[PDB]
């Protein structure tokens, strides 16, 4: 299913934001002379990918290019030359983190809760496809419509060999404040290391795009977590909601919740939003001629 693309099928118009891990252009693609245009997002990764690195980005894109779930962003086409290029259905509303941050006032508790479900759903699918997204966070979730979020990719997901449960990343730059502890101390990432980032990410939306462990150097998130500190109760959060997050930040990772469970809970709290989420002011929110 993985479309391998000709550098001359898509024209990358403008730069749409760019990290030092990658750079995302927008973003128009037209298949082999085929008719007209479908606006895509071009993710181009950056740091010199080894032969083993590429196999990995490959394998996952074979999977990413074949997703059926609505809450995971499906790959369109990849474009190897001297650089990688993922072709993505363009998402206009965009980075969700940056959405809640400035639609703060009008975001209901119904949205917050569904979003969580959707995400938990996307993430659940990616688990059933042996994937280990290794990069789930609020910035990494996209808005189709304000009532429909999809999880996007940028190469960091890793495909799991049938008879494996582990994964041992190499080195380099990691989102440290969203990672579990094995991940941090051990460069080990699994499906539970993945739920832990579900934790941070839901805390991230409950605090309305507030910054995790703010004021504290990544240099010892390691120890704060080692001492026993986690992310604070968000203000809008009744105990029920919030110790579901604080379940995801447990040390031993086999006993963090599973996305399959995580789906039920938030799905039930979802058909009863205000009973769990309290947001002050919630109930309102040529031819013709002269």
């Amino acid at each position: 299913l993985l479309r391998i693309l000709k550098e001359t099928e898509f024209k990358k118009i403008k730069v749409l934001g760019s990290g030092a891990f990658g750079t995302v252009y927008k973003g128009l693609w037209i298949p082999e002379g085929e008719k007209v245009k479908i606006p895509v997002a071009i993710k181009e990764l950056r740091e010199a990918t080894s032969p083993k690195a590429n196999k990995e980005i490959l394998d996952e894109a074979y999977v990413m290019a074949s997703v059926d779930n609505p809450h995971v962003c499906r790959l369109l086409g990849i474009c190897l030359t001297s650089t990688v290029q993922l072709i993505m259905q363009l998402m206009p509303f965009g980075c969700l983190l940056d959405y809640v941050r400035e639609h703060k006032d009008n975001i209901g508790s119904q949205y917050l809760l569904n979003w969580c479900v959707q995400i938990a759903k996307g993430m659940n699918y990616l688990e059933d496809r042996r994937l280990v997204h290794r990069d789930l966070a609020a910035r990494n979730v996209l808005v189709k419509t304000p009532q429909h979020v999809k999880i996007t990719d940028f190469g960091r997901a890793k495909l799991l060999g049938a008879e494996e449960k582990e994964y041992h990343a190499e080195g380099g730059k990691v989102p440290i404040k969203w990672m579990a502890l094995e991940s941090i101390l051990h460069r080990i990432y699994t499906h539970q290391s993945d739920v832990w980032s579900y934790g941070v990410t839901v805390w991230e939306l409950m605090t309305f795009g507030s910054k995790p462990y703010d004021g504290i150097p990544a240099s010892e998130i390691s120890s704060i977590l080692e001492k026993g500190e986690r992310l604070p109760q968000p203000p809008i959060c009744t105990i029920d909601v919030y110790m579901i997050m604080v379940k995801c930040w447990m040390i031993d990772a086999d006993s963090r919740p599973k996305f399959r469970e995580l789906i039920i809970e938030f799905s039930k709290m979802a058909r009863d939003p205000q009973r769990y989420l309290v947001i002050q002011g919630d109930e309102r929110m040529e031819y013709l001629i002269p």
């Binding site: 504290i216 001492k227 026993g228 500190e229 604070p232 203000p235 959060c237 447990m250």
Partner: peptide, 30 residues
């Protein structure tokens, strides 16, 4: 139906502890 926090005029601590919950504090151990 409302067991929210108690935060003073709102603010939130950088981190909240769960020590000595052995399930959260990590046997360093050292």
């Amino acid at each position: 139906p409302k067991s929210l926090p108690s935060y003073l005029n709102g603010v939130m601590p950088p981190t909240q502890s769960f020590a000595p919950d052995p399930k959260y504090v990590s046997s360093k151990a050292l």
